[PDB]
Amino acid sequence: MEFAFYICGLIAILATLRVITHTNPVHALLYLIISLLAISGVFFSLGAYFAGALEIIVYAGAIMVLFVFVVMMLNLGGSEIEQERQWLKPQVWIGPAILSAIMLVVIVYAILGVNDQGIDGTPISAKAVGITLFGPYVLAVELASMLLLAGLVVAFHVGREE
Amino acid sequence: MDYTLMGKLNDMVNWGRKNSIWPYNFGLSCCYVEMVASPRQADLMVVAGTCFTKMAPVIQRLYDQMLEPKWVISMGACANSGGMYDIYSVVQGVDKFIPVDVYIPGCPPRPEAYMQALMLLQESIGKERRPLSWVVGDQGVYRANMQSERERKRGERIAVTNLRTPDEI
Amino acid sequence: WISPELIEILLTILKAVVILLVVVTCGAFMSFGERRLLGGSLQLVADMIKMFFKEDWIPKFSDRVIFTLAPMIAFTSLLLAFAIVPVSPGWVVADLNIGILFFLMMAGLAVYAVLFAGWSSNNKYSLLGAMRASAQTLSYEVFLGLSLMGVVAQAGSFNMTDIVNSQAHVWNVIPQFFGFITFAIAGVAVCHRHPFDQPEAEQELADGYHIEYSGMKFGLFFVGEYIGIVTISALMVTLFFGGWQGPLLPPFIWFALKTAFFMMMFILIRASLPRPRYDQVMSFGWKICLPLTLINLLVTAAVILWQAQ
Amino acid sequence: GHPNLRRIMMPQTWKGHPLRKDYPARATEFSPFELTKAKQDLEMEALTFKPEEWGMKRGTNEDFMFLNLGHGAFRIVLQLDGEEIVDCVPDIGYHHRGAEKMGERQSWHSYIPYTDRIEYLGGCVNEMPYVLAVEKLAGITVP
Amino acid sequence: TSTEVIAHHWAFAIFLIVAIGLCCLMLVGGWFLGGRALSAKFYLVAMFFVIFDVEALYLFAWSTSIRESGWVGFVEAAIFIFVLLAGLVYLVRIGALDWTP
Numbered sequence: 040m041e042f043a044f045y046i047c048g049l050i051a052i053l054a055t056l057r058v059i060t061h062t063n064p065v066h067a068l069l070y071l072i073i074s075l076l077a078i079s080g081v082f083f084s085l086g087a088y089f090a091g092a093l094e095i096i097v098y099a100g101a102i103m104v105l106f107v108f109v110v111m112m113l114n115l116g117g118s119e120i121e122q123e124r125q126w127l128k129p130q131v132w133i134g135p136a137i138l139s140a141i142m143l144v145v146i147v148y149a150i151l152g153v154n155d156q157g158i159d160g161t162p163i164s165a166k167a168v169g170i171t172l173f174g175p176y177v178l179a180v181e182l183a184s185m186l187l188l189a190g191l192v193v194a195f196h197v198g199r200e201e
Numbered sequence: 202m203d204y205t206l207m208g209k210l211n212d213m214v215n216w217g218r219k220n221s222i223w224p225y226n227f228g229l230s231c232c233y234v235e236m237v238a239s240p241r242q243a244d245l246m247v248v249a250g251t252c253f254t255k256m257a258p259v260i261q262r263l264y265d266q267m268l269e270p271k272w273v274i275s276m277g278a279c280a281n282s283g284g285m286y287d288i289y290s291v292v293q294g295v296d297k298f299i300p301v302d303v304y305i306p307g308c309p310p311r312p313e314a315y316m317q318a319l320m321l322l323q324e325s326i327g328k329e330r331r332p333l334s335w336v337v338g339d340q341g342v343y344r345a346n347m348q349s350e351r352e353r354k355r356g357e358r359i360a361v362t363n364l365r366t367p368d369e370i
Numbered sequence: 371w372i373s374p375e376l377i378e379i380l381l382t383i384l385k386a387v388v389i390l391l392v393v394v395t396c397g398a399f400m401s402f403g404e405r406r407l408l409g410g411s412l413q414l415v416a417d418m419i420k421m422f423f424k425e426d427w428i429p430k431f432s433d434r435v436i437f438t439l440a441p442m443i444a445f446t447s448l449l450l451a452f453a454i455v456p457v458s459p460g461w462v463v464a465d466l467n468i469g470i471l472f473f474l475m476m477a478g479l480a481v482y483a484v485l486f487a488g489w490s491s492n493n494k495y496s497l498l499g500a501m502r503a504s505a506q507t508l509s510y511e512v513f514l515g516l517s518l519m520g521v522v523a524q525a526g527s528f529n530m531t532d533i534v535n536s537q538a539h540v541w542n543v544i545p546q547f548f549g550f551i552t553f554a555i556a557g558v559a560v561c562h563r564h565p566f567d568q569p570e571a572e573q574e575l576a577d578g579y580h581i582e583y584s585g586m587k588f589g590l591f592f593v594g595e596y597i598g599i600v601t602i603s604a605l606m607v608t609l610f611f612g613g614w615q616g617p618l619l620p621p622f623i624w625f626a627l628k629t630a631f632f633m634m635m636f637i638l639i640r641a642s643l644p645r646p647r648y649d650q651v652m653s654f655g656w657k658i659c660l661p662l663t664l665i666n667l668l669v670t671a672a673v674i675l676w677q678a679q
Numbered sequence: 680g681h682p683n684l685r686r687i688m689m690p691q692t693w694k695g696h697p698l699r700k701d702y703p704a705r706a707t708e709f710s711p712f713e714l715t716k717a718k719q720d721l722e723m724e725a726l727t728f729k730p731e732e733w734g735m736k737r738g739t740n741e742d743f744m745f746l747n748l749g750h751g752a753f754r755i756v757l758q759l760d761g762e763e764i765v766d767c768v769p770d771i772g773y774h775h776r777g778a779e780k781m782g783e784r785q786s787w788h789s790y791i792p793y794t795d796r797i798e799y800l801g802g803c804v805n806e807m808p809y810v811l812a813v814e815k816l817a818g819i820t821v822p
Numbered sequence: 823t824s825t826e827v828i829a830h831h832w833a834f835a836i837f838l839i840v841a842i843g844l845c846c847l848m849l850v851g852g853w854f855l856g857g858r859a860l861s862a863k864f865y866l867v868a869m870f871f872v873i874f875d876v877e878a879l880y881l882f883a884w885s886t887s888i889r890e891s892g893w894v895g896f897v898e899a900a901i902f903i904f905v906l907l908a909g910l911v912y913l914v915r916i917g918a919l920d921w922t923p
């Protein structure tokens with residue numbers, strides 16, 4: 040239950056590292072789906088079963104389908120960027136990578152030194168998440184519906200063809 | 202028997218190819234509507250009609266889209282040789298430009314003639330040797346020079362004496 | 371090296387692999403049954419030999435990874451979605467607490483087969499046709515889950531064996547008739563079955579995504595298609611028709627009889643019910659089936675909370 | 680004054696007019712050379728489609744799309760506003776057998792099978808007007 | 823840490839591994855053997871699927887605990903479902919979901 044967590048975390052890290060340093064959009068989305076599967080494996084290794092279930096049902100099964108759908112619709116076949124590839128020349132990526140490494144080392148220094156009994160991995164089932172969702176989190180559910188309705192309206196208003 | 206340019210599995214492969222044949226029926230002309238799958242999935246091409254000069258390229262391209270192993274059956278005198286249309290706009294035979302494995306005379310042949318051609322093709326497939334893999338062994342196709350059908354059936358054809366007279370149905 | 375935990379885990383491994391081989395062989399047998407009704411095992415073996423030894427050709431202007439990955443998805447998605455179905459007491463592959471949620475993950479991954487095949491088939495018409503097909507499958511996967519959620523509400527949990535045990539007295543086809551018909555429609559839509567076989571037939575600027583797939587990848591698509599309807603029928607049995615529960619026959623016999631009956635019913639409505647239009651399919655889905663699932667879930671919740679003393 | 684006087688039976692790159700009396704009826708030698716040219720122009724036809732070599736107009740408005748469609752096999756070029764047909768020209772001549780030229784090269788008796796193979800579903804219906812016209816030429820009244 | 827749960831874990835692992843290995847090995851056998859020689863309504867329907875799938879996941883969480891939430895949870899989910907149906911009716915009526923205008 041720990042070996043699965045470490046191997047899935049390593050797979051997720053390597054997959055998003057390949058995502059941010061790739062040029063083909065479909066390959067980037069495929070490696071992104073691979074990392075989402077890995078992070079769902081991370082969730083299942085921790086006992087958050089419902090989180091992994093919604094990770095593959097929705098994140099790697101609805102949102103990334105929309106990203107792939109848009110990629111095929113706009114038909115990116117080397118529109119002046121696949122022939123340039125600025126993110127491989129060092130003057131574009133060394134600076135932001137240095138800044139990100141500094142932020143990572145600051146956050147990691149914050150993480151260490153914090154008391155840790157370990158993660159038990161006890162399965163928090165979907166019925167407990169459902170009880171909490173419609174119990175002490177009622178307005179969160181109703182206004183998450185309101186938020187998704189707002190997103191529906193704005194995405195229709197922008198993206199319609201006419 | 203002679204052939205033209207470790208053993209039991211070859212017979213197994215031949216049996217599998219022989220019993221599973223997926224046709225691509227080329228319409229072309231009236232042999233098609235007598236006798237009645239993408240070309241990528243089909244392994245047998247049945248040319249049934251006149252090879253016109255305007256759609257010889259269509260036949261050539263749809264033959265080139267198919268994948269090895271591929272066999273060709275030519276039904277009808279038009280696809281055999283040009284038939285009765287020795288004329289400017291007709292290619293005199295589909296074997297001018299694609300290799301044909303079985304030929305059927307007739308204008309049109311019966312559907313049972315196409316069944317007989319399928320049996321002939323099945324025997325031809327069963328008695329040939331092809332490479333098992335593209336990395337091991339000879340990468341050559343060994344077609345067998347089979348006994349001709351008109352010399353095989355010569356004795357019973359010559360032995361015919363009397364037929365029914367044409368004044369009855 | 372003799373101990374009965376090792377013996378037990380080897381028996382469960384044997385049960386899982388036996389289930390897997392029976393599923394793949396029943397899918398191949400259904401492929402031949404549909405080919406024949408519209409030695410037989412010798413003809414299937416000869417077909418498999420032809421697909422093995424024909425050359426697997428990849429287009430030069432096509433991505434190799436996506437083209438190779440689409441039939442693997444089309445097979446493995448519902449072939450792994452079968453793993454939650456209990457075919458007999460003690461003969462279930464995995465007793466997951468997510469269950470039909472795991473089935474929903476596999477359906478959501480199954481849409482990627484159509485999308486990937488359409489993109490890797492370097493053709494505008496094939497891309498448009500597969501994009502219409504993926505739009506239809508999304509439009510029916512939008513309510514597949516809720517059509518199952520009615521039964522989850524009645525059983526009270528996501529586990530498969532719990533649903534089967536709640537189907538001890540009355541099978542949920544009788545209370546959840548609308549959930550049953552919506553699940554049947556969405557399952558027949560997800561696996562690309564008739565009526566919704568080829569949505570590109572309504573327009574000549576679109577072509578099928580099965581084209582340019584030749585030989586063994588085409589065979590992967592075919593066997594995965596029939597395996598997908600194997601597991602759709604088995605899930606319909608275990609969610610609406612008692613699973614393995616019956617009065618006289620042994621439980622596996624009852625499950626097999628129900629699954630075979632739904633198999634022939636799917637063959638029959640391939641053979642009988644004709645073709646609707648594409649906009650008719652979209653309108654029917656988005657304007658009938660999703661509100662039907664919502665109203666059925668509300669009525670199910672009201673009935674459940676009414677019958678709670 | 681004809682709007683588009685192009686070839687309808689022969690391909691556009693055809694030399695000579697086959698029904699003239701100095702044009703030979705019989706088939707010339709086959710060439711893989713010309714065959715691969717005709718194949719390569721059939722492969723590049725969609726790329727180099729010029730919609731006035733067909734009588735079309737307003738070619739790419741720019742919402743209009745030109746397609747080719749595949750009772751016999753023939754092509755028809757379609758001009759579309761979305762899914763509505765604005766104009767279409769059917770490309771025929773893919774089934775041209777030179778039957779009238781064969782009429783000039785068979786005897787009156789031995790041309791009868793060729794009359795059968797025009798409108799192949801007809802058979803004797805296609806046989807009938809030919810023998811009726813030959814019998815008009817021959818001064819024959821049949822019983 | 824019972825023998826039944828570890829037996830089921832190993833059985834599920836063997837099922838997944840043998841299934842993916844069977845598909846991969848059969849593709850490998852196919853490749854190795856044998857000789858050689860757009861419209862924006864699609865975005866609209868995918869977007870609607872995404873949004874309605876997230877509201878579906880909310881109902882997924884609700885349905886497994888209908889008994890424990892009581893009538894108050896029924897009222898909350900009825901408000902949720904009514905908002906969802908109002909959005910669906912809005913999309914249908916203003917022509918977002920009409921495929922042939």
Ligand SMILES: CCCCCCCCCCCCCCCCCC(=O)OC[C@H](COP(=O)(O)OCCN)OC(=O)CCCCCCCCCCCCCCCCC
Nearest residue numbers: 040043046047050073076077080081083084085160823831
């Ligand atoms: C092997 C080296 C790498 C080889 C290439 C990559 C292959 C995939 C590697 C990752 C997935 C398999 C990892 C190994 C899992 C083996 C089973 C295991 O460890 O189970 C432990 C645990 C069981 O559950 P629990 O009840 O919590 O355990 C208590 C123990 N009594 O289990 C759990 O709690 C959950 C287990 C993890 C979640 C399920 C599996 C997720 C799979 C994600 C795949 C992502 C995509 C990978 C693509 C690779 C190729 C690019």
Ligand SMILES: CCCCCCCCCCCCCCCCCC(=O)OC[C@H](COP(=O)(O)OCCN)OC(=O)CCCCCCCCCCCCCCCCC
Nearest residue numbers: 076083162446465466467479827830831834835838839842
């Ligand atoms: C080319 C390869 C691409 C990648 C292919 C897949 C990679 C992984 C394959 C190897 C998997 C090894 C085994 C993994 C563990 C199996 C057992 C398991 O999941 O146990 C954990 C848990 C048990 O739950 P339960 O027993 O009910 O409760 C006990 C209390 N803790 O059960 C769970 O948590 C169940 C939920 C996890 C189920 C994961 C299923 C696989 C997901 C990936 C599918 C990939 C589909 C193909 C590729 C798609 C496109 C990339």
Ligand SMILES: CCCCCCCCCCCCCCCCCCCC
Nearest residue numbers: 389392393396457458620622626629
């Ligand atoms: C289409 C049917 C698919 C079924 C897949 C799983 C098959 C499992 C077979 C298990 C056989 C034993 C079941 C328990 C004993 C009861 C029956 C005994 C006689 C067979």
Ligand SMILES: CCCCCCCCCCCCCCCCCCCC
Nearest residue numbers: 177178181182892893894897898901
């Ligand atoms: C335990 C039995 C209770 C029976 C009576 C139930 C009905 C009365 C209480 C209803 C409370 C509903 C609260 C809903 C809040 C919705 C907020 C929406 C914000 C947009």
Ligand code: SF4
Nearest residue numbers: 232277278279308309
């Ligand atoms: S051989 Fe005879 S029947 Fe066949 S296409 Fe030619 S004219 Fe028609």
